Amino acid sequence: SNPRLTKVLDEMSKKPCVNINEIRKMIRNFQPQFIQPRNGNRPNAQPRTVDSFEWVVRIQSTVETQLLGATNTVPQQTLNLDISFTDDSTTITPASIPGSISMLDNSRHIPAIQSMIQNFKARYLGSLQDTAQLQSPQYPQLLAYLFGQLIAIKDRLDLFRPSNPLSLADALFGFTLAQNARPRYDDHRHAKACQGPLVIPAATNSDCGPCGFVQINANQGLTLPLGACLFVNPETVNDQSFQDFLWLIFATHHRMPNQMQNNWPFSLNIVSTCAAPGRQAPHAGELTDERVRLALDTGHRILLSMFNDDEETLRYYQRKGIETMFRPCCFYTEGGLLRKATRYVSMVPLNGLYYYNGATSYVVSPIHTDAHPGITAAIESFVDIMVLQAVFSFSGPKVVAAKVNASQIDAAMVFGPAVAEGDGFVYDPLRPAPPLSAFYTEFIHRPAEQRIFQMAMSQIYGSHAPLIIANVINSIHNCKTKIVNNKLRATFVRRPPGAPHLKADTAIINRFHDPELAYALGILADGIAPLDGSHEYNVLDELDYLFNGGDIRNCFGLNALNTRGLGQIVHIRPKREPGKRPRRGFYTTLDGQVHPVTQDAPLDEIYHWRDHGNLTRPYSCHILDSQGLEFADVSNGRSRGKILVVVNSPLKTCAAYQGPSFAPK
Amino acid sequence: RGLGQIVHIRPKREPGKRPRRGFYTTLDGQVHPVTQDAPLDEIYHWRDHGNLTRPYSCHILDSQGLEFADVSNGRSRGKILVVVNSPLKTCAAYQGPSFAP
Amino acid sequence: LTRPYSCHILDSQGLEFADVSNGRSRGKILVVVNSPLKTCAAYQGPSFAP
Amino acid sequence: RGLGQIVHIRPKREPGKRPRRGFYTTLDGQVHPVTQDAPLDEIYHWRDHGNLTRPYSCHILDSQGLEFADVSNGRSRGKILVVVNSPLKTCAAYQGPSFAPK
Numbered sequence: 001s002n003p004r005l006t007k008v009l010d011e012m013s014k015k016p017c018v019n020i021n022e023i024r025k026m027i028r029n030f031q032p033q034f035i036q037p038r039n040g041n042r043p044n045a046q047p048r049t050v051d052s053f054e055w056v057v058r059i060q061s062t063v064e065t066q067l068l069g070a071t072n073t074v075p076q077q078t079l080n081l082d083i084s085f086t087d088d089s090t091t092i093t094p095a096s097i098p099g100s101i102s103m104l105d106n107s108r109h110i111p112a113i114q115s116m117i118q119n120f121k122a123r124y125l126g127s128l129q130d131t132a133q134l135q136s137p138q139y140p141q142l143l144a145y146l147f148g149q150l151i152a153i154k155d156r157l158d159l160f161r162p163s164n165p166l167s168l169a170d171a172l173f174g175f176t177l178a179q180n181a182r183p184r185y186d187d188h189r190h191a192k193a194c195q196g197p198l199v200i201p202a203a204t205n206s207d208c209g210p211c212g213f214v215q216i217n218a219n220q221g222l223t224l225p226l227g228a229c230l231f232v233n234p235e236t237v238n239d240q241s242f243q244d245f246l247w248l249i250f251a252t253h254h255r256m257p258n259q260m261q262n263n264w265p266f267s268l269n270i271v272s273t274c275a276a277p278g279r280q281a282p283h284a285g286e287l288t289d290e291r292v293r294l295a296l297d298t299g300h301r302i303l304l305s306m307f308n309d310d311e312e313t314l315r316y317y318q319r320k321g322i323e324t325m326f327r328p329c330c331f332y333t334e335g336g337l338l339r340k341a342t343r344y345v346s347m348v349p350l351n352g353l354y355y356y357n358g359a360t361s362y363v364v365s366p367i368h369t370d371a372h373p374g375i376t377a378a379i380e381s382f383v384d385i386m387v388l389q390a391v392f393s394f395s396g397p398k399v400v401a402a403k404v405n406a407s408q409i410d411a412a413m414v415f416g417p418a419v420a421e422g423d424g425f426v427y428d429p430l431r432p433a434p435p436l437s438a439f440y441t442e443f444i445h446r447p448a449e450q451r452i453f454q455m456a457m458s459q460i461y462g463s464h465a466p467l468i469i470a471n472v473i474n475s476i477h478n479c480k481t482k483i484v485n486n487k488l489r490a491t492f493v494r495r496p497p498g499a500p501h502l503k504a505d506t507a508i509i510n511r512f513h514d515p516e517l518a519y520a521l522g523i524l525a526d527g528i529a530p531l532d533g534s535h536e537y538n539v540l541d542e543l544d545y546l547f548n549g550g551d552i553r554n555c556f557g558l559n560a561l562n563t564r565g566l567g568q569i570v571h572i573r574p575k576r577e578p579g580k581r582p583r584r585g586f587y588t589t590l591d592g593q594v595h596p597v598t599q600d601a602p603l604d605e606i607y608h609w610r611d612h613g614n615l616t617r618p619y620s621c622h623i624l625d626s627q628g629l630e631f632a633d634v635s636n637g638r639s640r641g642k643i644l645v646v647v648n649s650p651l652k653t654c655a656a657y658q659g660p661s662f663a664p665k
Numbered sequence: 666r667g668l669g670q671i672v673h674i675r676p677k678r679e680p681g682k683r684p685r686r687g688f689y690t691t692l693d694g695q696v697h698p699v700t701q702d703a704p705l706d707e708i709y710h711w712r713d714h715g716n717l718t719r720p721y722s723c724h725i726l727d728s729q730g731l732e733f734a735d736v737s738n739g740r741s742r743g744k745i746l747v748v749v750n751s752p753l754k755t756c757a758a759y760q761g762p763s764f765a766p
Numbered sequence: 767l768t769r770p771y772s773c774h775i776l777d778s779q780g781l782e783f784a785d786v787s788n789g790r791s792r793g794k795i796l797v798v799v800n801s802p803l804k805t806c807a808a809y810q811g812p813s814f815a816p
Numbered sequence: 817r818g819l820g821q822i823v824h825i826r827p828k829r830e831p832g833k834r835p836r837r838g839f840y841t842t843l844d845g846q847v848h849p850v851t852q853d854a855p856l857d858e859i860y861h862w863r864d865h866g867n868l869t870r871p872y873s874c875h876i877l878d879s880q881g882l883e884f885a886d887v888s889n890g891r892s893r894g895k896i897l898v899v900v901n902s903p904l905k906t907c908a909a910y911q912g913p914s915f916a917p918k
Contacts, residue, residue: 025852095800098808137806406701410790413701414676417683426701441796478798533890549683586696588686594696625686646891648821654853657889675788702788736786 004662005448008394009455012660017459018522020383022654027379028370030650032057035159038082038329039491046162049187053087054493055160056329057375061649063516063531065614069641070564077615079514079647082329083378085159087493088192091324092145092260093344095478099470100346104138104308109355113231116355120273122218138352140228140306142264143249144314145347147303148321148377150252151296151367155374156325157185169287172251173198183255193255200281207279209243210250212269215276227267230306231355234274243280244291245299264349300366305356311363312464318367319377320345326374328382331513332617333487335495338512339385341440344475379651384468386518387460390526391453392443392510394662397551397619398423399590400439400483401506404430416588416625417549429505433482439509440476456524456660483507504590511619520649522659528553528618529663531645539570539639540631543603547587547626552609553618554664560643562611567604569639572597575628585628590621597629614645668705671741675702677732689728699731716747820857822892825850828881838881843874850882867898 036042038054059081065074114131121128154168162184170176171184177197186193206213216222236242246268253266280286287295307314323343330336367373392398396419406428415424423443427434443449458465487500518525519532528551537557546555561569574585574597586596587607597606609622633639676687676699687699689709699708711724735741785791827838827850839849840860850859862875886892 094802095798096804103806403701407703409787412790414678414684414686415700416686421678421684437796442794445794477796478800530889532888533892534894588698592698594688594698596694596696644891644894646818646888648818652821652887654824654826655885656887673788734788738784 002448005451008452008660008662011662012452012455012459012524015658015660017456017524017659018653018655019462020380020460023379023383023521024376026651026653027376028365031371032159032375033060034058035085038493046160048163048184049182050086050156050160050162050185051188053188053190055086056082056493057085057159058082059650061647061651063614063645063647065560065643065645067560067641067643069638070561072564074560074564074613077613079516079615079649081331081382081513081517081651083375084327084329084493085156085325085374085378086188087190087325088186089324089327089343090192090260091320091343091345092264092347093475093478094263094347095344095474096346096348097470097474097477099466100474101139101141101348101471102467104140104310104352106134106138106353108308109231109353110134112355112357113353116231116273117216117222120216121222122220125222134353136352137348139348139350140303140352140354141317141347142350143268143306144303144317145321145345146249146252147299147368148318149256149324150248151318151373152322152325152377153185153252155322155372159372159374167285167288167292169248169282169292170285172248172255173283175283192257194258194261198251198254200279203279206276208237208270208272208276209246209279211246211266213276214269214271216271216273224271225269227265227269228350229353230268230270230302231353232270232272233357234272236356237270237272237274238277239298241291241294241298242302243277244282244287244295245302247280247282247287248292248295249299264347267350296368300368301359302356304363305358305360306354309361311361313467315367316464316467317345319380322367322373322377323381326378328378328385328513329493330488331490332508332511333490334507334509334511335484335486335488336512337436337481337483337509338389339381340481341436341479342385342388342472342475344479345471346474382513382517383460383521383523384472385512386515386521386523386525387453387456388472389510389512389515390518390524391449391456392440393526393619394449394452396420396423397508397621398439398443398510399506399508399621400425400427400434401504402427402429402485404428415621418551418621418624419549427483429485433484435479436481436483436509437476437479440479444473444476452524460523483509506590508619508621511617514615515618516615516647517649517651519659519661520647520651520656521653522655522657524659525661525663527551527663530657530661531556531614532647532657534642534644537641537643539566540633543570543631547623547629549624551618551620552616552622556614556643556645559611559614559616562609563604567602569633569635570603571600571632571634572603572606573600573630573632574598575630583628585626587626587629588624590624600632669707670704671737672705672733672735673702674699674705674708675732675734676700677730685730687728687730687732689731690726692723692726820855822886822888823856824853824885824887825856825859826853826883826885827851828883836881838879840879840882841877843877853885 035055035057037052038056061079061081062076063079064076110131114128114134118128150172153172157165157168157171166184174183174197177183180195181187182191182195183193201210204212206215212225214222214225232242249268250266254261303314304311327339327343330339367376370376399415399419401415401424403426406426408428411425411427412421413424413426414421425439444453453469454465457469461468484495485502485505486495487502488495489500515525515528516531519530535556537560539557539561542555542557546552546558552558558566575583577583584596584598586594588594607623676684678684688696689699690696697708709725711718828836830836837849837851839847841847860876
């Protein structure tokens, strides 16, 4: 019993959303055109070490409006997307909910492992023949996360070509470092990486690279260690690339923050049937580019075999790991927080029994070889943040404002039309700000911003939907981020810890980036209607739609003429009620003031809004309420013409303007 | 002496139409909005002259969309007593005509 | 986390409860319990008052 | 002038028998093919004279398996005005017989 819900569901059924394969196909293979620090210009030559956490590759995209009837031409705007590309952040949390993390099934690792432990094992420990005690939990997650982090290191070094280079292996290990200095990469204020040169662990009897080793032979003993066990044939253990891959994984695991390092120990250790190949501990210049690449390849093969050859969750965890160092940069001065509350993947210490003999499959294009995986991971994340944006805004702007002496019992005041009763909260400013998990959770549980999310994600990803959905929900539940009174100034990565202040002391908490990108990519978009082609506009009625609780962005008939001469086009007068009583009218802006209008007068000096061109803040709630207005016309015609807007962006996907939406017709 | 614990003011949520911020207009045209329900003494004020207030002060010109709910356990309908012992009282004490008896 | 069986109020007779807030006494709450000794059967066990 | 980000060409989206790929043949012999979605500007990329091209040049002879998806709502159904003034405009200039496609 909800007409809007059923209408939207039927629409989404009519025009299925574009599954992610198109996004991957489009983004996989273009190099960035230019990379520069977010605020300013790049220097002549890049410094020795990435040290300013603002460098961001950007993706230009512009809009030009064009129409006859206006006084002068309209200047073009630059809607460009940015990618953080330097700053670090955590993404792994221990919390969980039912679907947040699942354990794989060792239904094809147990037969072989038992048949290989029954024969080559001293004939005095007894016959095992039970195939039921080999039931340790199967959680091969953290390996993929570390793999992703390693790929991220590689990509970050490649993009920001430093002046004096070093081999990726050399930079990662950091042989020629100082006592407690930062690694060659990731050396800045926010950097979180174990400093100092990496230390090889020890010179024990049974070594097989960085991890422990146990053999199964007659004149020996057998005792499976506690962590994970990767049972492999003697052929590969004595191979070369595999040893290098193990060393690389170990190396990237010891650069995590010390505390998080203690939480999730690197417990891998291999068991086979041949003599232990002593640890090699490469140093100075043993590993080189091609050898590293070969090791990466073999490691990817190993991980795929560990995942029951799933390759869709593997790519998921790999993306999530690579996301600690690449991520989209917000676009609105509000502060770019919608991402910060959706970035957590639950995890558990690795464990289980794994057997690896061959390949069992071949993937045409794995993530680790696609010409800068960082960008593709960042955009793969953005294509989800935008869907979340679309679902939250399904009802209204969902503002959160500040008022002094607000009741510390309930924080729900009605703001007027265009803001549904549920949303539109308020909070005292002089006390610590709210936690921002006290709103989102309340938003994504209703059976209107839930089913939409369900079906949209289902269409985007298909069978491997639940995992993402479940996980993101968990992220919302425990997010410590808080709302703040500051601005990002549109040329920063983080709020400058000075005294930026809000224009209206309020924050809209459901906008992350302009919906135009959502339309272009084909994903779901809401509210705001698309602007790419000829449009019939009726100012005399569009403006009316505005003052009764709209937003200017839908009203592309106004922005065109905002200061091109809208003045001598339309007048506003209080009301001409021919009967009961001649009362006067007024309107309320996003602030409290309720300045009124008494007589006929040109519109240009009654509202007088800032003119950006044809790209205004979509959820700014310019006017909340207004009663008693007429909007007379002051020119025959000249208020029922045409307008043409052209937007060309480099990320136009395959099915660009054929996606579901429910913006006013 | 009360009216901070006896009566509250809240916007009217009666129909299913768009919620609107109730407002009332004082004498000088200062439209006052009432968004979040609050105790009455925090929304409107006026000097206490006991029970002799300026008769025609024209306090509130108009108001639209307002509700008044009490928050005291049924002791908002009390009785009061007033005594006016003026020294220029005459025979026809209160027998004169009026408009609103 | 209050003591489960503290047996606070044994009995009461003749009492009424009326709210004095404009319809914001029926809110929602969220609780998170990330214990480190969670097992596979997270919450699938039987009970008495589901 | 920007036809590029207006229309895409893709091989074919036949929902049944077989996903084969498409190609076109120019006036020369070469039969260079098209496999995936891509902007039109780098698949044909013809010389631009303005609004007066060789009328009988046979730019493309054959093509099988193409779709021409649109990549912008509208922006591909507008108007155009061409003015040609020549000094030899005769008396009855645009009132002569012809059989060009309607």
